[PDB]
Ligand binder design. Structure first.
Ligand SMILES: C[N+](C)(C)[C@@H](Cc1cnc[nH]1)C(=O)O
Ligand SMILES: [Mn+2]
Ligand code: NA
Length: 449
């Protein structure tokens, strides 16, 4: 048994994006985000920015709606917006290098009332639904079709369901209410031995073809052949129990496992353990979305990139993280691979659970290479600076989606998490974050020999 009462619709091929199917997918995208945002009990909590590097929650309540409107205006499927001031106020978010830069940016913003932003959402929903009902869906949809703006808006909303869930997780438990049917994975369980598996080397082609019949973001496209040498990777994501051993061996107290930049981050934030653990009465509790529970020892540990690399430092002996090409080889092999959307059901993706799961519990989630949960459970960090593939081109609808972040200051992560939905659960999505940032994200370890 797994989570069932809250359901996320699978993504749809562009050749099957009929008006009726898209109506259902749109309604589901929006209702899911509504369920998440309604879990905040008190409206005053929307003026908190629980992550010090992101905007207050009120911004994210409006932003998904404003983005749909702004892109539909840009392709001229909408002749006017709903509230021009809000379309500007909620237009774009933030990716600051530090909390002081963000604090300076948000210091003098007059935010609307929570009820006014909910009213904006409800009006936007009805305006977009009417656009859908009054537009011909001439199959197939594609990147030069006006309806690309709608496809982009729905994936953007599902991405913000995921990133907003990480903000609500940073609120105190007394400030949020678990939605009916939210179901965590089973949590008792000591981890099994995490064996190193030889991944046979081969050649991969990274990227996505322009006429592939699936919505994707600009940075997904291009074509890059990479020869990948054989390498060893741990069959499981590193677990909470494995990371607890690192803590007990003074992992956060030993400079040689860190570097000057990551140690500085650790000291500045007085970090002694992963973000969502707390030590009390001699033992660690763990913060799931809405509840504190005993630390689930066999779940994948959730860390930022700095902490993943510090664990690699403790392992020593050339222990490292995979590259993007190495993850692709392990997850999809060397094959014109035809995505099968139904396979999303085989991994802890798309709200199969409302939490990470024990490594290996989902019995269909072993890739052919032998590695477990390459797809799903938690994103996994990669030692790969976010970068374009040959053939990359920004899209007119969102020219700065990815180009600003090809800056050697963002590391990549791939594969999707329990909370990931839409085309972000499939092969081509490329994800990236500053290395100090927290997501529903872990890692596995690699050695060359
Ligand atoms: C690709 N990530 C997940 C890093 C992006 C997704 C995104 C949201 N709005 C525009 N892009 C981010 O969170 O900034
Ligand atoms: Mn956004
Ligand atoms: Na994964």
């Amino acid at each position: 048994s797994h989570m069932s009462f809250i359901k996320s619709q699978l993504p749809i091929f562009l050749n099957n994006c009929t008006q009726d199917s898209v109506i259902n997918y749109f309604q589901n995208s929006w209702e899911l985000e509504n369920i998440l945002m309604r879990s905040i009990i008190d409206d005053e909590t929307f003026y908190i920015n629980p992550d010090p590097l992101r905007n207050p929650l009120i911004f994210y309540l409006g932003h998904s709606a404003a983005f749909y409107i702004n892109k539909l205006i840009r392709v001229e499927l909408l002749e006017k917006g709903i509230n021009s001031d809000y379309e500007i106020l909620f237009e774009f978010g933030v990716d600051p290098e530090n909390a002081e830069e963000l604090n300076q940016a948000i210091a003098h913003i007059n935010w609307p009332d929570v009820r006014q932003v909910w009213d904006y959402r409800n009006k936007a929903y009805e305006v977009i639904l009417e656009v859908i009902k009054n537009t011909t869906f001439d199959l197939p949809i594609h990147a030069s079709h006006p309806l690309w703006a709608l496809m982009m808006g729905m994936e953007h909303q599902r991405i913000h369901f995921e990133t907003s869930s990480m903000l609500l997780r940073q609120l105190p438990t007394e400030k949020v209410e678990k939605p009916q049917g939210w179901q965590y994975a089973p949590s008792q369980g000591v981890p099994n031995t995490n064996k190193m598996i030889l991944v046979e080397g081969g050649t991969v082609t990274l990227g996505k073809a322009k006429d592939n019949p699936l919505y994707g973001w600009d940075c997904e496209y291009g074509d890059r052949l990479v020869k990948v040498d054989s390498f060893f990777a741990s069959q499981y994501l590193v677990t909470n129990g494995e990371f607890l051993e690192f803590i007990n061996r003074k992992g956060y107290e030993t400079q040689s496992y860190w570097n000057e930049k990551s140690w500085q981050w650790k000291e500045e934030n007085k970090v002694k353990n992963p973000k969502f653990w707390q030590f009390n009465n001699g033992k660690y509790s763990y913060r799931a979305m809405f509840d504190e529970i005993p630390l689930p020892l066999d779940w994948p540990v959730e860390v930022n990139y700095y902490e993943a690399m510090a664990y690699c430092g403790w392992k020593g002996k050339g222990t490292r993280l995979m590259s993007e090409a190495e993850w692709n080889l392990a997850a999809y092999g060397s094959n014109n691979y035809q995505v099968d959307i139904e396979k999303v059901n085989d991994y802890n993706l798309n709200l199969k659970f409302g939490s990470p799961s024990p490594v290996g519990l989902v019995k269909t989630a072993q890739s052919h290479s032998g590695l477990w949960d390459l797809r799903g459970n938690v994103w996994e960090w990669l030692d790969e600076n976010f970068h374009p593939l040959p053939g990359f081109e920004p899209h007119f609808l969102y020219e700065d989606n990815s180009a600003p972040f090809f800056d050697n200051n963002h590391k990549m992560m791939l594969g999707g998490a329990w909370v990931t939905q839409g085309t972000e659960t499939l092969k081509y999505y490329r994800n990236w974050f500053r290395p100090n940032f927290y997501q529903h994200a872990g890692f596995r370890i690699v050695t060359n020999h």
